[PDB]
Structure 1
């Protein structure tokens, strides 16, 4: 159905259990998938890894029946955090079409990064089109749990607010952006507009004003 979460400390080795365990001799594949990217398999035969895969990953061969197919990851770092699928191929079951239940690996006690908030006023050409939108961009924050509150003068906006759910980038930090749709007359009315981004206990505020 859905994904199974897993939490591991940084640098400490880890193991990932496999659902629907085999009933006989089995050949399991372990796929490492990151959202939006191409899935990479680490272990095609339970003990064999293709060229390029690092030696930190390893799988449990089935020399004697009864062993459980787990995926061991030594030296857990930022890059290992992804979704892991366990393909199953036993002798008792028929054609195994589906992949195993996804396993959400999360690396713990990873240092938190302060977000880099960037607020942009609506362009002059956008005002000519009789529209106005405020772009508040958040970058390079690790704990993906930011709450974006908007402020017109000392008043919260609360309306026309659209915000993305945080998404990881290449730096393994998350990235989120908030959009505030306004009318060009309301933008010209107030003195200044503020974007408040609360990250963990902290809160950063950027303010922009019309020319």
Structure 2
């Protein structure tokens, strides 16, 4: 479906409005869902939350018709960055098959972090099979946006690069790969290769050489 944006500062309180207003007496669910991750049920009844969810997660009870369902996340931290769904059941609307449109929470103000670049040279067994491939591993940076640059000696190379898009870690930081594939001959004929990771305003470079 289509997603709605939302930005709250770290430590502040998020107010996630539901997508579909109810027509009768309701029973709304709230699922926290991160991409590539199993969703977790935050709140099942209009306000009841299961064991293992913190008190900072709050729902609105349905005591009088007219109230609008909102999810309240007090003290938002970096981990609360996910998709949130408003499963809206009520009396007059039918069967709630649809979880509804997502509200992607993006907590602002997280600390900045610097990449941990590491570049391995082609493997000997790899070189034996007439196939060489360098590997540049960027990790532990934030915000999740890096610019890789492969330099054969001094002149740059762009034919043969494949850069994985930034993805979040368990530290709530980002990590990305970048592979330079080249024939085993052009790996020895060159002086040295380099991988230049540019993150935010700073560049950092790890170089390797055939020896």
Instruction: Give a deviation string over 1:48-107, Cα, whole Å, max 9, x none.
Output: 011121100001112111111110000111211111111111222111101121111111
Three-state SS of the structure 1 residue aligned to 2:178 is: strand
Deviation of 1:156 after TM superposition, in Å, equals 1.2
CA RMSD of aligned residues (A): 0.9
* 1:101-127 superposed Cα distances (whole Å, 9 cap, x missing partner): 111111111110011001110011100
TM-score with structure 2 setting the length: 0.97
Runs of 5+ consecutive residues of structure 2 not aligned to the other structure: none
Deviations 1:135-182 (A, max 9, x none): 000110120011111111111111111011111111111110101110
How do residues 180-191 of structure 1 correspond to structure 2 at under 5 angstroms? 180-191=180-191
Residue 2 (structure 1) shift: 2.4
- Displacement of 1:3: 2.1
Give me the whole-angstrom Cα distance separating, in 2, the residues matched to 1:63 and 1:46: 10
Q: Secondary structure at the match of 1:28?
A: strand
Distance in structure 1 (CA, Å) of the matches to 2:4 and 2:197: 30
1: distance between equivalents of 2:96 and 2:47?
20
Question: What is the deviation of 1:7?
Answer: 0.8
Runs of 4+ in 1 over 2 A off after TM superposition: none
Partner of 1:20: 20
Task: Report the number of matched residues.
Answer: 211
Where does the alignment leave 5 or more consecutive residues of structure 1 unmatched?
none
